[model samples]
Target: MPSAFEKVVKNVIKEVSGSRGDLIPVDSLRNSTSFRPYCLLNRKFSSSRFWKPRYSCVNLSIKDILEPSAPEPEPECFGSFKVSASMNVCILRVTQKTWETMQHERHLQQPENKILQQLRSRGDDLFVVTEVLQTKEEVQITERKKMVTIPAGSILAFRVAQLLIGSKWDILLVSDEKQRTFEPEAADFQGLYAEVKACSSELESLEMELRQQILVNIGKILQDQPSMEALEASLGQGLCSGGQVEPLDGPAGCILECLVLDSGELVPELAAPIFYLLGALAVLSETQQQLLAKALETTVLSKQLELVKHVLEQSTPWQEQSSVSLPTVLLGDCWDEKNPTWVLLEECGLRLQVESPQVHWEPTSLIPTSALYASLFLLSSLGQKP
Candidate 1:
């Protein structure tokens, strides 16, 4: 479709609003060649074919013409996807994210092809100009300088055909702000994907350690917990006739002590509560269960609870090896840096209800790297978006 600032010429060409056949300085011709042909006169017309002439001047006009629409971005311009995959189970899932990016590139090219086709017939530097004179504005480029209107004008103006920010006038992009389209094509995809790979590596070790510590410790903690006879009593279940506390004579202390300590540095004080948080995760990771007896349909929630039970069962942290120190790997090595010095004897989890990472965190936490690493890996795998 033609633009609001456009006009038609000879019923075939497009012109935009700028200079309407306006006379221009002839000195401007030193660089321009497109309009020279239209300025030729006195050359023949057959009367001149019979009689030769000496006069070399007729008329001249110059106006800004809109440039042809830009060509479609080339597939090569989008760059090549040389993204490699990793064999690690954690990193393997991230490859799928890059594949999704691949899909995005395909979706992106579809509309760009339309714009690309429009410029197919366009000649190099061809333009359409409507010849509208421009209006001026006083711009205060800096507060230091007083405002002034610079008679700014585009020298080789054409009808612009149209413009796109983000190399896209895509409807999906209308709500988004302008962004650069000048990246080295797949470089962005490569970096983002590489980060995910590094990200996955970082998360696996922490989750492994966390699940391991919790699983190993939770078993003993449950065994040592006070009997839930009262809980059973409240639920209308009678206890066995003679429920005497049969205390094990075994060494009951330090059974769940997994954060092996020499007793000078890391505290066992943290060991108990650290297990407490792992224990709390089971309690917090669900929708309302209290409504089970209140709501009409409880099957959905029953199934949901079963799913959580299955996930817990699948998370056999007990079989995993105990973490030593931070258990964190510097992902910086993936981006080309190496260091053996890093620490993570403990870890943390996703944002919890009303609690803070900083408050309950220093006593129990992983560095920000673990969060970034774990968050990206899991989200992309589930295809969940912000």
Candidate 2:
């Protein structure tokens, strides 16, 4: 025999209280804890006609709300994805199957079609959510997943088209629904996706990681030194010292500078968006795209950060703005620690250590090797940022 509490639970429905003043007919259930809404709405009240969209986006964030000292929960359980700038989401692949027959061995599986429906109805604007079950696979949700988000209200006409597969990864879903829920795959997350989403909970760590790794070139491509070609040519390499064609650093001898605009912005849009169209203008291979994209990503990040800076600029703080450092204007001299001139110099993409050929501070950059390459290398990297 089923208990009274079990009966009450099974009979539960969504809440529709206009205010919080109606309740007292408990079935003698104890004080409880869970994500339960307060009241139960009848079918007529909760139907499509009465359900309305909210004005703000449904940005769910639980990681920050958890009790500070609580021990961590299971890692892979309830793994969800965040709806980002695009409407497309990373959903389990829709199989060549349909409404009446979607099933696992024990139960009928229905996708959270409400999200998709809202999107289709809203035309071009929406926010949403869903959870995942798991299996084996090695890709992020592509162009055609089910739990896609509807883009927001602003800039609808200007939203650019994006690729359906790869270059990204997710949140927002929990399910007994068995769509073609497969696991995620990639270099860093080989078996973690299938394992976590199918099996475990915490996704914030992974999502945070993805956000960080996705744009490897958000920082400035500062110039610490002159082009390497100006220093010396390797064995038979440059016009400077070797038997080569024109000078590698171009007409200018040993130029080194930051590339940001005087307004502290990144505006290489005219030069940056020349990506392959219809695969026709194909030039570089995918393997090489990261380097170039990283370069362009820096500019993109600069533009993004400029928004942050503008907001901060309006505030009266930070104005003792760490005193702008003046250039020594002397060769072989490192930039003064107090100077912000580093932001003003031409962006060289290839950041070299501003060795005083003298006092050398530790230098770092992603040209990967020692920062021996020069000026044109940056332009070459910029050409690839898209």
Candidate 3:
């Protein structure tokens, strides 16, 4: 029985080559073994609506039609007819059988089989052919003589003169949707605390070291022979040389001012210890009257011994007056064993005895690390008024 597959192929061939009357015999094509098959898949068709007067172009090779398979229809498509073919090239032949009503058992029982083989070389030149589906006429035909022809599987690119209702070829070079999302995690806490702790300790130790070094330098100044003499002169005559009797300021300001030499280098270390000794002397004397009484008692030893000792018992302790005559015994280097200034300087070194019992020496507190014993001995030897 001549089947439905053979009938469709015969009808398509007659419609294509009808005017020529050189209709190719179907049996001749099948017997001569040039028949090949093809597929038709239903899919979505998309187009650029702006472009007009559309015509489409498809490129294919002889081997593609030989042993073919259909692509699955898109989610929007309907057809799934299993076996199909296209009779486009006389160069290629095929059989099409649509088993719309055939039972599954009947399909498996049929013993009919054919070993469909490829007759085209992979290197065969491609053909550029144009055909009209309505006229069933091949309008133009040409050979593409390139060594590398595209093997057909899927058409990734194409051109069209106008739009059609068929499957879309997505250029996916760009995406449809716009935005994306992200997340982050990690923080530093312990390291920052450790750094602050270490830096605070570093700062404290540095301040202590600076204080120690300052005291060591002061000791060096006191030991230097010239520095000791200079300090003694300043304390006695005031820092203004040529002995014009420069007015004395308050003790702390006076001491700080005297340390600046005429040469502009300030030996402030020299004054720190001197301030300490002066403060200690002031602490001990308590009052100028006591200083004088002590002096008179010491003087009684040279001549009026017992008489001076008895007079000291009746003496009263007294203190200061601004612009009062600064005794020559206080200003000049007069180290008479009986001088009141000498007595005050001497007693400060041996032991400090404060009558008022509730006083503290502030300068000693200020320069706590300076050489106490060395400063007392230096003051005793220099013997200029504090």
Candidate 4:
């Protein structure tokens, strides 16, 4: 009785050869009697620990079926096996992932075919090294050479047409357990994987540029003479404008006044929280920032407002008790509009959650004044945005 592998190969031959115009018919091609499985790797004298394509493949020849009259032309597959129309070929059963690996390796000018001949000479036996010693962190990996075989007729075919050259004689041997289409996912779109990576890199690069500009703008305001006055003027000027801001009586003074002591020293507790709040606002785009600053001036309450006075007054003694060091914003995980929140970590390991007022009803216990203003002003800017 013929092996199951032989039977499947025969069915595939009949299907391809019998079809008139469906497949590039082959008449001379028959069941490969001498098609003994060959390993693609040499276990001995090899440095690598894990030998991929541990399975073996059998090579088969193909002959084109012809007609007496004339004919037209047409035909492809990936997973990276190359074939010459005039040459014989081999079929193998490997993981789809391993197939991609081999394809990439070959594309990069790596020696993928050299190993084929190496295994062809090394015979069909494969050696698997198992690590049996589990107790120690490091142990000598033990070796066990086991004889592996391909079942009789476990090969399936993929009908991809974009990667083939001559006729569709490219046969891929897929086993029963490993059967699936070669269609790539969105992230790995055929021939467009590089473009996907490029797009992601471009987005990250633009974000990095924006982050740098934000820090630079903050530094310019802080380094100016009378930093609070500069900050207020910049806020009023709507920093998007290229020119300087004219000094004006604004609501910013009401908040800026509390950040300074009578001797002109900036309170770290007040300054740190305010700087962090301003940092979040600064992250908006230019035109959006301009509109946001204009909106903030109108929404910001005057010193006469009871709520405004209450929050600022509460901040005084909190500054006196213990000073807060400069707070750093965690920018690694980019902010999502669906989940609008900024994470600020203080020097003492305190995590401050800054969010829109609509999200949280009450102010945070640690920085009530800063959190209140951030909620009111930032939300005013963020409203109706994407």
Candidate 5:
């Protein structure tokens, strides 16, 4: 019976032959005696074509295979052997000691087979030590050089690209220098480039999609409320409502008045909250508006509104605070103005005074005097006017 290794070699041979367009049948491989010797003998004979034989006693079956009438006769008392054929090539080996000796003798005769001979000669010597040391040193130097080269080149290219393209685009070049060095056999630079390109394209597509979605939503909102009047009425009914309107006080009031008169610069902190309040009013219903007004009374909105009112009152000159001056009258007595209501009446009348072009509401429209006057008139009718 053939050994497991011999069976595996035979199977490989059959498979390779079938795949290579060779008509050699697998069943014919069972003639191990002739088939095994044929493969081994072919390899041994072909190896000697490049050089002269080193040992005189070594003999091969090449001449016998080429010319059957050659002097050297095939050894009759040979041991068991096996042969594995793949494509047009064959591997042959002996199963027992005597045949193995014959094969080894044949192998030693070829001068072209110097590599195998040398390996066998120094198999138990200090060859491994010298080879390992040389390999280690070469590997270390190669690794260091690769580390210094790949990353330095890649990073330099990345930085240069960034500088050339500017900050608007997101361009990142990932370097796998360590992968290239330690896994030189495995790293695929082409695959890395493809991956980078794919990721960048995906990010750009996602950004465009998000922008389109936002614009679509904004357009829908604008179309829903086509007219400025409708927008203001809707905003006023929703966001603006009854809250305690306090009288404007000292220095803050003066600053507020000056700012209103100047109207050149925007106070961002005041502007942002007011915008948020207006948006809330625009979106909320009457019931929600009352709930929000109640919430504002206890929160910072009351304080912020009072601060704004104080600033408005102070808009009058210092001389006018003690005695009501003509300028103060023209400006309207914020202190005497009993009901000061902030409502959204019309988007057309509301001109945004802020420098930011995106903000659309006017400060005056956000604080409507008509609503304020109505509140005051109702209060006066009740004999509880402030």
Candidate 6:
């Protein structure tokens, strides 16, 4: 009597070869062979879908199929099959059997493993094991234990080895013995701060000197009479003629007023405009004084000192004017400063009267030549008076 397995094989062969004679070869069937068996008897079936009969008749329980045993032969040649009883799912098993055949065939020809042979070849010349003595002077190997102590210069190399060593070694080695140290007082931070402060103080002193010099020069020019006369003549022609005074609605007019006040008496018609100009100058001067005071409070005096020094250096020409008694020359520099100063003051709204046109006021117009003369005159007065 043929076994159920043999009977199923014969049936499967006969069923596969129908009237069309389409028979699958045994060699092709060999590739499809599985070590474990399964049964589909208890599965739910639908009448509409047709299922072809399988010839293999081996007795298999649902449990046996769900957890099949490991394959008997190499896993590459015979695959294991698994089934889930609860979900009715089938799964194939993978194990060491996959590589058994290849391993066996290779081992028959070569006794040593391929990986071991490659490692041996690599270790031959580059990594020769030798013994040295353990000492502080130089690396020394111990003869009995075959161990070595690292020297100071080779500390880095020893450290790398320590990191790489996954296995335990027989002996311990000392590579370095130096202690790390640092000093807090060596930074000299306070000294650096003091030096910067000194430089700033020096600069500020210079700037203050320069500002005083410029003021002195301006004072001399303001007190000069000849230059003031020339300025008055120019103003009469340019501003007082025909009852058509120069326009006082702009910054230029404010500068003219400041010059006139310091140099000579204002015309009756120009008195109001002159007052406005003076008021503006006073405001601007107050603002400047306040700003300087605030700066002194907040900033390092040393840094500010340097700026003062620079201002003084630049004011050298003005300083020379301290002796300028000739009104013509003194007036020139005075008018120069006054023009720009008043222009700035007017733009800043310090001179409010001129800004409003409804007041019907006409301020002095600047004649460059006359203004220069006026400044020269003021400087001469300053020199003579002081």
Q: Write the per-residue lDDT of candidate 6 for residues 1-386, one digit (tens) a residue.
A: 12222233333333333322222112112222221221212111110011111112123311222212333332121211121111111112223332233223322212433422222221210010111111113333233254433332111100000000112111112211121110002212233234333322322232344323433432332344233223333343333222333433233344345434443444443433222212222222233323322322222223333322222223223212111111212212332323332232222212222221211111111111112222222222222221
Candidate-wise lDDT, in order: 0.23, 0.21, 0.25, 0.27, 0.23, 0.24
Please give the lDDT score at residue 250 for candidate 5: 38
Off by over 4 Å in 1: 1-214, 227-256, 264-275, 278-386
Of the pair 2 and 6, which is ahead by TM-score? 2
Best by TM-score: 4
> What order do candidates take by lDDT, descending?
4, 3, 6, 5, 1, 2
How many residue pairs clash per model?
A: 17, 28, 11, 8, 8, 46
lDDT value for model 1: 0.23
Q: Which ten residues in a row have the lowest lDDT in candidate 1?
A: 85-94
**Winner by lDDT between candidate 5 and candidate 2:** 5
Preferred candidate (TM-score higher): 1 or 3: 3
Model 5 off-target regions past 4 Å?
1-265, 299-386
Please provide the root mean square deviation of candidate 6 (C-alpha atoms, Å).
47.6
Q: Write the per-residue lDDT of candidate 4 for residues 1-386, one digit (tens) a residue.
A: 12333233334433433422111111111322222121111111111111111111223111111122122111112122222111122233224454343333333112323432333232222221100100111112112452223322222222111111122112243312222111112211121223222322322222334333333343343333245334533432222222333332333444444445565445444444344344433322233333333433223222112232233333333322322222113322333332112211121112323332211111112233333334233233222122
TM-score of 2: 0.15
Better of 3 and 5 by lDDT: 3
On lDDT, the leading prediction is 4
| TM-score for each candidate, following the candidate numbering | 0.15, 0.15, 0.16, 0.17, 0.13, 0.12
